[PDB]
Design a protein around this nucleic acid. Sequence first.
RNA 1: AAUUGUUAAGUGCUGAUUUAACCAAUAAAAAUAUAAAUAAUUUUUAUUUGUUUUUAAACACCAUUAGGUAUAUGCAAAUAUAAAAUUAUAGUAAU
Lengths: 159, 65, 198, 96, 171, 82, 52
Amino acid sequence: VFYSFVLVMKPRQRRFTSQALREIGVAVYSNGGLIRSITNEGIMRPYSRFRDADNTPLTYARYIILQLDMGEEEMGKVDKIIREHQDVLMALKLNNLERPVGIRSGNKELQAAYFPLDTFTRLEEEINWSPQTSADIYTQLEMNWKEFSRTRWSSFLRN
Amino acid sequence: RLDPFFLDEREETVLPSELPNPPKPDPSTPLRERALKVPAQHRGHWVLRDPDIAITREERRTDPW
Amino acid sequence: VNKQTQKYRTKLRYRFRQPSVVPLRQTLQQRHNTILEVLRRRRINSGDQSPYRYVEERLYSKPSRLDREGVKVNKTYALQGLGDLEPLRYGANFGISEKDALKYETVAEKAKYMEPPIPYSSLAARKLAAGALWPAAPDPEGMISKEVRLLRHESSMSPSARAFSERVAYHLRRSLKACPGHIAEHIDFTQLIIQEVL
Amino acid sequence: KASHIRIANRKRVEMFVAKRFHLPTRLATAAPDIAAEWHDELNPMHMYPAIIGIGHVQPVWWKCAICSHSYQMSVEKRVVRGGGCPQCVVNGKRAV
Amino acid sequence: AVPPPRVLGGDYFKTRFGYSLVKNSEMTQGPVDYSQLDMWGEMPRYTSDMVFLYLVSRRRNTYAVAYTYEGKRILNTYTAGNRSTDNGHQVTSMYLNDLLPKLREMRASEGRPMGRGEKVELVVRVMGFYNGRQGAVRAVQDRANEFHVRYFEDITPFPLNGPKMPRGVFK
Amino acid sequence: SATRWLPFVSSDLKDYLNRYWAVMFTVGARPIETGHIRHYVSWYCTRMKVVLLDHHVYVEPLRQQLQEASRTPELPLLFVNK
Amino acid sequence: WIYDGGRLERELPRDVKQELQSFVADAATTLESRVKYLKELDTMNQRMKDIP
RNA sequence: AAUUGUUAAGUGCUGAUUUAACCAAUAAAAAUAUAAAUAAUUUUUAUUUGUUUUUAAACACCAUUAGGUAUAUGCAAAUAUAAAAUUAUAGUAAU
Ligand SMILES: [Zn+2]
């Protein structure tokens, strides 16, 4: 992934959030960029209540992961569009996607010994792992799991 | 009249010591005489922001909170 | 560096500091044990003094060791008859002699010109067989208490001491939660009361 | 270093130029009657009078308050140079 | 060291304590999806009818406030000037003297009698590390028939940055 | 000096013994038995490495290897000269 | 760290202790000791004056 | 391992906790080591002081309870980091 954003948005109506995401995608595509992915993560209750433009503390918020491939000047344009949006309370810019964290400030001998195509070609869920994600889930995809998981409920149906 | 943000938080944070629904006084009620106007970031607890427990200048020289 | 890095550098310098380990309390503990052994073994005439301080002055003072080396001091400042209870500093086979050190007027000249001391002797062999080369460890006073009869008043101490104790009380009551977290996970702060600093 | 503040919790500006320029020259604060005629539908959602200044030279949409008419005018032309509705000025000369 | 004794049934377990394990509401729901975990899972479990007592001890003052589950101030903050160890003890005792009929009035307006047998559920939180901390909580300890304290904790400020401190503290 | 400072950590008991002269492996829930060995070792002016097994990244490897060197599962354990 | 528990007692202040030592102690022994100390100081000053 | 970041980052001034801090710019790159100055005339991260007035709400300080003063950001001036050259002092009384 070239760039990723975690958009925290106000839980408005469906049409307002749809228009906000549509304007964000239009600003991405008009500057000559590509959307790798956009995923909605539902409404969760954060540990800190963000304030909107009219200084109202919001208890709930919607999280959206946005993975993009854009040029850096155009990414600055889209970031200035996103950070000045009325519905976006907070959005961090994941700029450590091509190079992993700890290489630049870590060991000096282990600085040019990495491969950027290892991290650039995979998605953001394969770089920053979720708690439900693990290596055995990745090995299950290449092991022909359809012919093996058909017998996993043969003991629980009778009890 | 201006500056509501300067005495208040950027984002409402809730400490673990005040859980749940942290006790916040009403902003219309004024504080005590000669008291200290501390921002809502560098406060130890919201009970310390009560107008009767608002620390003054002479209490600041003796007690920290 | 800027102001922030300089403040963090001097904070790390004061936090992680190598102190000078000078074995002074073990020296005084060995001297206390030797004085107690001398007071137990031999009957000592006090002469309007405390017997502990009298045996201390007769053992470890400068005219006592100079009388051991031979100076013709006034009247017998050191103990004459001691066997294995004699301190190893003033043994006959030891490598430190104050008659050789009296011609040097500076400690640097003593460190420069004097010979290295003799490591092993017969009295050193007897103290090795007795295990008296290092004093025994006392009861640990680090974590039990400080049991004392009275407490000093604020009028007895200096006004600078009162101001300093007020500053210690302020910064202790302010940041008592700002301790190392591996000790803070066991301290029950609901019962802790700091009443005063003297 | 430099300290910053966020205008309407969105627009990160530097603190010195905010007290001189950025804060008192916003549309919603300095011209509240003009900012009440802001068009909420045709304008972009990342553009609103809480962050857009007085001298925004690019034309934005304005919803007129006397008549129901939307038009495009610059924000500096509306506030500094002095602007109004094009249908209201063509009805003003028609009446008198 | 020694394990606590065994309970064999919930019917007399309800009589052994002031609560019961088996709920009588009989909550019938079908949430096949995974449940939503709380933000603060490792915390005291605060029931809605619990009074939060705040005891702020200082050098020459001790304050006692009582808040509800939602943050509503029940009684005004008692000051020694308005009304030491004995100072905090008398302030907390005269606050708990007047806290009972105001609690009965505020709970009888909704439908809670709180007349006989039911003790006021209390959570005590202390500030200060002073001598008045000693006498205040003791003034809650003799009220065991009236105020049942479940969570005795403290609310002590962590000095994150601090605006500034006066000159006598530094120099 | 020539290398930036770094905290030592190891998953094996043998690297702790070969590095330090006096190593002690304690727990945070036992402060009295830890502080008594702190008084005895510092009385003889001996450099000592105290390893708190609370909040360590190799607790389960080190709790197994301390059971093999000392048959009793009691902490703290003093290790001098391997 | 000094544990108190309410059982340990404070000492007397400075001025009350000085007034108690001025009120209780006998005047004759302190007076003759001060006179002997004054004569010792005068003898020391005279011996310093004698050496040229 | 450090400096700067406004148009780039983190940001309540990262140093309260903590010997460890994302990202962006910066680690080397003419001949000669004997060669008789092969080099430049620049900058300030630190301390004060100025620059503007409903134009810091606060916190702190001097007149005693209320006024002003500054303080942090934006710029700016002065001084300073660092040995050597040049001139002189030999003995003090403390914890
Ligand atoms: Zn019109």
